[PDB]
């Protein structure tokens, strides 16, 4: 199944933050309606934040997270969780190798803000 | 059912 | 129901990261076996990271998040989500006021690391 | 935090199913737009299904689950989870006593159907 | 990623329930420790329960859900959610066709029971 | 709430 694609409400500000846990340098691309809106890159095996930014979900609300290592797409896993009918998390894990820890880049999208 | 099912098989 | 308490695997490293979305200064306390292991503080209405740290879950694996604003406990909401039976997120929202947005401090715990 | 309240897509069919795990007879009230749309009453300590029904979220999409035992409201926990941006679960647990297993009535709402 | 595989606490009773929403007859296999422990089958486009059972997770706690429709494995999506650090749901959706509603067989695993 | 105190500081 497709993973890393989320329908946010249209015109909604959201946070996106990525953490790295891999020997490979992680490249996280955040697309808003199929156009790159942010790109984070970095290397850590200790959960370092490799980027955090506030974006707007735009007219469509469609947000897509893509993770690669030197251009190679990682395998993605994802879900959206809503707490108390108000607080939204869109979560992505990614696997760039063979050990299935799925933490190699971890991406958290949260909304609403403010 | 029907359409989409057969096309998925042929491709 | 009790919120903001999670059982991690014992003796395991995890990441904890807090974001702020409120006029009020947020104080996030992270307890490992009922002792304060980290405290983050800051104020933002734009999802600023007010802290991120790697901790060990200790003997019990019990990790609790508490949030207060000028000493007053916020109301908490929480859940844990596991993706592909490997990647864990423990999620906390908190409410310091009357608008039920539960983003006033948002805390994300993730494991495993590395 | 409020629990057991979910905003579904409006005018959408959804399943609701309740399981019981308590000595107490469980009454589950499912409200659509603030009006009771289904009630289940049953008793089991072995996770028996005490009801299942297809409902429609109506013009507002507001769905609320309430659980009571001998007229006493149970304490609720809930969350919504979305898989592959398409498949939705709204989940409710409830506690009628003091052991905090929160399974005394478990309620699962799923959509889409068909 | 692998989907529909969960590590439950070992030697623990859990419920497993399947719903169908497809023209195709669904066959849902539940494996514990790599051996078939239950098989549900049925056809519905109205979310009918096609099976519910209590099982024991055994010495390994390993539970796997597989879904087949007209001789082909369906594509699976899954996640585990924990509420109030106590109430667990392991959720599976599956797609037998092209519409990607992922509801063709929906499987809910819940624990603890009783 | 909180803006009362930051404005008292800023102004
Ligand atoms: C340090 C390792 O780096 C990668 C593999 C090598 O390289 C990751 O896939 C592993 O999960 C682990 O983080
Ligand atoms: C056709 O067999 C496809 C199939 O059945 C449809 C009625 C609908 O439920 C669809 O999602 C499913 O894949
Ligand atoms: C007693 O009525 C308490 C009640 O029933 C028990 C059998 C157990 O399921 C408990 O969790 C529930 O609250
Ligand atoms: C005080 O004004 C309320 C407080 O700060 C607001 C800016 C908003 O973030 C609100 O959710 C928070 O409770
Ligand atoms: Ca890896
Ligand atoms: Ca890794
Ligand atoms: Ca608030
Ligand atoms: Ca806020
Ligand atoms: Ca109970
Ligand atoms: Ca019980
Ligand atoms: Ca389908
Ligand atoms: Ca279907």
Numbering used by the authors:
A (entry chain B), C (entry chain A), D (entry chain C), E (entry chain D): 1 to 114
B (entry chain H), F (entry chain E): 2 to 12
Task: Give the article text.
Membrane disruptive α-helical antimicrobial peptides (AMPs) offer an opportunity to address multidrug resistance; however, most AMPs are toxic and unstable in serum. Here, we investigated 31 diastereomers of the α-helical AMP KKLLKLLKLLL. To establish whether the CD signal observed with diastereomeric AMPs was indeed caused by α-helical folding, we prepared derivatives with their N-termini acylated with an α-C-fucosylacetyl group for crystallization as complexes with lectin LecB,67 an approach which we have successfully used for oligonucleotides, cyclic, bicyclic, and linear peptides, as well as for peptide dendrimers. X-ray crystallography confirmed that high or low α-helicity as measured by circular dichroism indicated α-helical or disordered structures independently of the number of chirality switched residues.
Crystallization screening provided good diffracting LecB crystals with well-resolved ligand electron density for complexes with the fucosylated analogues FHP5, FHP8, FHP30, and FHP31. Diastereomers with one, two, or three D-residues (HP1–HP10) generally showed activities comparable to the full L peptide ln65 against the five bacterial strains (MIC = 0.5–8 μg/mL) but were slightly more hemolytic (MHC = 15.6–62.5 μg/mL) than ln65. For further evaluation, we selected the most strongly antibacterial diastereomeric AMPs irrespective of their hemolytic properties, namely, ln65, ln69, dln69, and all diastereomers HP1–HP11 except HP6 and HP9. These AMPs showed good activities (MIC = 2–8 μg/mL) against additional Gram-negative and Gram-positive bacteria including several drug-resistant P. aeruginosa variants, although none of them were active against Burkholderia cenocepacia, a Gram-negative bacterium which is naturally resistant to AMPs like colicin.63 Furthermore, most diastereomers were much more stable against serum degradation than the full L-sequence ln65. Similar results were obtained for the other active compounds (HP1, HP2, HP3, HP4, HP7, HP8, HP10, and HP11).
